[PDB]
Amino acid sequence: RRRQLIRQLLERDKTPLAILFMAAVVGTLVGLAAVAFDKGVAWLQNQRMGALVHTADNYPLLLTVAFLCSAVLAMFGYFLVRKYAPEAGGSGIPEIEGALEDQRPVRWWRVLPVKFFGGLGTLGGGMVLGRQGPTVQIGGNIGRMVLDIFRLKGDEARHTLLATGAAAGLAAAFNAPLAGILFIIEEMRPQFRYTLISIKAVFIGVIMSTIMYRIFNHEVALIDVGKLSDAPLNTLWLYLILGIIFGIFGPIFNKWVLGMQDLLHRVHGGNITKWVLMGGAIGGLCGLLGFVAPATSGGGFNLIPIATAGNFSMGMLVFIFVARVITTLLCFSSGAPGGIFAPMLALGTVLGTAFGMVAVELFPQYHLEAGTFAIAGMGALLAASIRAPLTGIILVLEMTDNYQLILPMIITGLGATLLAQFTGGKPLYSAILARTLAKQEAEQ
């Protein structure tokens, strides 16, 4: 039988040059796309200022306008989805993770514009939803769109171009080429059967996109925290303890995130309007908190550097934690076009920071610095929920550039999935494709 192996071995790493040359076009396109999307998202959150400041005199006139814009935007958001591509809703990844297994479709001629503009509306309005996930999906469709335009055929050219578009996307976003590749080959990639995905094609794409991004985003980071301190071996155990914690809570958060899209489903029954309305509802509720305590609203990026520094009192932290848990559920569970990827990053940071502080005093002889645990936890809720330790650890580092924390970072991210297994829990990004795949059928 090994008579074959010898041919395969001596045949390894030979990808159809034409599949490569496309991963490059995809990458470049997923890139220009991701850039533009991000830009517009901002441009809107801006106007939502030259509207607030414009009437800063009148107080209730603010609260009002900072509700109607987040409503009029969040509404226009849900709408575009419910009436044109009920798949743009939710994260935007399970539909790709499914599509890799030919279990869901890549209706790019719809999902592209829908997920784009749709998101500008939900993100530009400032809801607790990341723009990462949504970009992963925009990516895939970008890939499949060229796949169809050039009729390249055959699993490899289909699975490959589709997967490079997914990573080209998750990369041009956090500007983390490594975290991108690592994500596909650890989560996206069909989990229980060999696949015809060309690893080398991906890289070409991840780069092409990451360059396009750079072309329009140099001299600035997403999260800047500078070289925090180091972590001595005698303090390594504390990262397991924190690891366990995220572990027991990761699945629980998975319950709420799923069971909240059920309970939120009654309130509209599926009615395009009871939904769209409940849309400007949660939408507007955000634009409001997004000016009466911004920590509970918006993406949540901007507040990470400040949590790591330790500028939040233990209280304000717990407050922000709880409040965010709510706003994130209430927002993701409401089937609005937007990821729950980014927000979990915030969620973790905060929980991390807090654990830090407790520690910092409990052991004055360890000379701790809350900030380390904030980093040791920033990817921990990406480990207990979505369960992709490796992609999670690499993403953090990718953008917090603190490799001296690498050990505590893993000992935490492991204790995470090691306790999210030992206690129910499942790949939050899977359990979704589960329900959305068991609903396709089981309904006829």
């Epitope: 301190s229 001595p232 071996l233 330790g310 004055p364 002889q365 360890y366 000379h367 610095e369």
Partner: antibody
């Protein structure tokens, strides 16, 4: 690498003196600096310690502001302010650099140290 | 405030002799440290983490102990070992030093 601390001297009861410690031969940041004093004849007693960004400063069980340790990373210098001094404060004051092995920190590199006599 | 008390307050032994000094803790410590102090000089980090000679310490020296009681030893002490050794802990805040032991070239 040298740790040279000046400032010591003669002070009358109820006085105040700013001991200084100039560092050279290593990166002042990344380092926890501390003070320990040796009373003539007696042993050593830890005074305080101040982390890099000075976002942390601890002293031994002493009252309010008997001691006020601070540092100017811009001048790689460690400071120590003693107020309302009394004879028990007459000793040799050393500023050490702090590090660790497994993690149970030690006083890495000491300095000659300045003497402080408190008398009338 | 672990009360570290170094046993022999003062002791003398002729070079090439095997000398050992104790350092008991009132409570429980771990990874003790030792500092050598020769007349006229600020302390010098000798042994640490209970038994790690510092870069330069003659392999003549050896650390040991556990929890409640530790010790430092010199297999065949030399004359240049005359000084005062101070054991210190920081396994419990705030750190604390021992009473010190004075080694003297018995002659």
């Amino acid at each position: 690498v040298r740790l040279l601390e000046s400032g010591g001297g003669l002070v009358q009861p109820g006085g105040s003196l700013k001991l200084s410690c100039a560092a050279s031969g290593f990166d002042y940041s990344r380092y926890w600096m501390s003070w320990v004093r040796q009373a003539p004849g007696k042993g050593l007693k830890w005074i305080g310690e101040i982390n890099p960004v000075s976002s942390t400063i601890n002293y031994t069980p002493s009252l309010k502001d008997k001691f006020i340790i601070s540092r100017d990373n811009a001048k790689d210098t460690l400071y120590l302010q003693i107020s309302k001094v009394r004879s028990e404060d007459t000793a040799l004051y050393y500023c050490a650099r702090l590090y660790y092995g497994y993690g149970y920190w030690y006083f890495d590199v000491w300095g000659a140290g300045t003497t402080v006599t408190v008398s009338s | 405030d672990i009360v570290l008390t170094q046993s022999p307050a003062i002791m003398s032994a002729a070079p090439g002799d095997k000398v050992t000094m104790t350092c008991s803790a009132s409570s429980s410590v771990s990874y003790i440290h030792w500092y050598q102090q020769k007349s006229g000089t600020s302390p010098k980090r000798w042994i640490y983490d209970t038994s790690k000679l510092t870069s330069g310490v003659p392999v003549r020296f050896s650390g040991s102990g556990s929890g409640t009681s530790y010790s430092l030893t010199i297999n065949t002490m030399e004359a240049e070992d005359a000084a005062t050794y101070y054991c210190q802990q920081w396994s419990s805040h705030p750190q604390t030093f021992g009473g010190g032991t004075k080694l003297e070239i018995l002659r």
